[PDB]
């Protein structure tokens, strides 16, 4: 199954510059949403989350096709919530109907990272809008309620190593689970991307409880918390190397969460020799916008 990337027509870098903006502007005024964390974190979920249906053995999922829009996957329980970043990106493709879904739901991840003050991470445009047919089942997403032999096993199918799994989980220093909607609470209030997800793995005093859900998860008195697959990073004596690694540089997480993160959003696409180079966008305050 082959996804060439095909940009959109007659379009070029100073196009999704405009379409950048205008997420990014939007996530400056929206800034009420979920207790004043605003729409950032639920982005890069959203961007994760359509990429992450991808199954290398017969390249079906993957953000390629959009497939999110339609009624099966937007309505998986793995992606409950995330209705309302798709609601945010709604006014985004109104202005910009040319932008296909897949596209735009990627760069939503890149811009909210990028705004978060995370790193520059390269985004290639030409995904191309597929029919209803071609989306994957519910079902691909992972659980939290794991250890670490399940995470590891679950991201080859993604054609992660462990150090890319380590560095994508980094994005759980970001935003909070929800009761409502994966059956998991807490996690504060953040919206800056930094390596801290690794210092409080490392550093906090965690103690594993049961939620209100009947789920347990680890919890600090400093008002953290750790899904049991985020506290298994430090179960594992492989995931714990790599986690002081980043806890102790944090240069090399944002090269290598960039790297991974540019990854997991372009598998399943084949980009033509002649395709445009990855665009690296510009924030808001690079512009003095
Ligand atoms: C083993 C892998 C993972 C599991 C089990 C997992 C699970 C979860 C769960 C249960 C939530 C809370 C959802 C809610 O209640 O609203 C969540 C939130 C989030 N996840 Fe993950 N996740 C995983 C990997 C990732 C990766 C790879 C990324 C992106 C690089 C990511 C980014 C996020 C973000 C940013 C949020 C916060 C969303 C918000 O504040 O609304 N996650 N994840
Ligand atoms: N804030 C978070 C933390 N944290 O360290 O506060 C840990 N795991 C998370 C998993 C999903 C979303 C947010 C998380």
């Known amino acids: 199954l082959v996804h060439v990337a095909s940009v959109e027509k007659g379009r070029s870098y100073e196009d999704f510059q405009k379409v950048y903006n205008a997420i990014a502007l939007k996530l400056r005024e929206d800034d009420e949403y979920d207790n004043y964390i605003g729409y950032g974190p639920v982005l890069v979920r959203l961007a994760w989350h359509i990429s992450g249906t991808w199954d290398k053995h017969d390249n079906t999922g993957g953000s390629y096709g959009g497939t999110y829009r339609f009624k099966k996957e937007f309505n998986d329980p793995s992606n409950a919530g995330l209705q309302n970043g798709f609601k945010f990106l709604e006014p985004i493709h109104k202005e910009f109907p040319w932008i296909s879904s897949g596209d735009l739901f990627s760069l939503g991840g890149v811009t909210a990272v990028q705004e978060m003050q995370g ?46 799994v380590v560095a994508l989980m980094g994005a759980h220093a970001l935003g909070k689970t ?112």
């Open 178 to 289: 929800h009761l409502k909607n994966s059956g998991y609470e807490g996690g504060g209030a953040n919206n800056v991307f930094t390596n801290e997800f690794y210092l409080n793995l490392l550093n906090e005093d965690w103690k594993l409880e049961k939620n209100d859900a009947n789920n347990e998860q680890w919890d600090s008195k400093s008002g953290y918390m750790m899904l049991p697959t985020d506290y298994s990073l430090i179960q594992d004596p492989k995931y714990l190397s790599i986690v002081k690694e980043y806890a102790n540089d944090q240069d090399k997480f944002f090269k290598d969460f960039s790297k991974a993160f540019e990854k997991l959003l372009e598998n399943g696409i084949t980009f033509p020799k002649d395709a445009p180079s990855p665009f690296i966008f510009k924030t808001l305050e690079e512009q003095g916008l």
């Open 119 to 164: 790193p520059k991470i390269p985004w290639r445009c030409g995904r191309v809008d597929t029919p209803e047919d071609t989306t994957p089942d519910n079902g691909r997403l992972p659980d939290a309620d794991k250890d670490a032999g399940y995470v590891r096993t679950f991201f080859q199918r993604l054609n992660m190593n462990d150090r890319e």
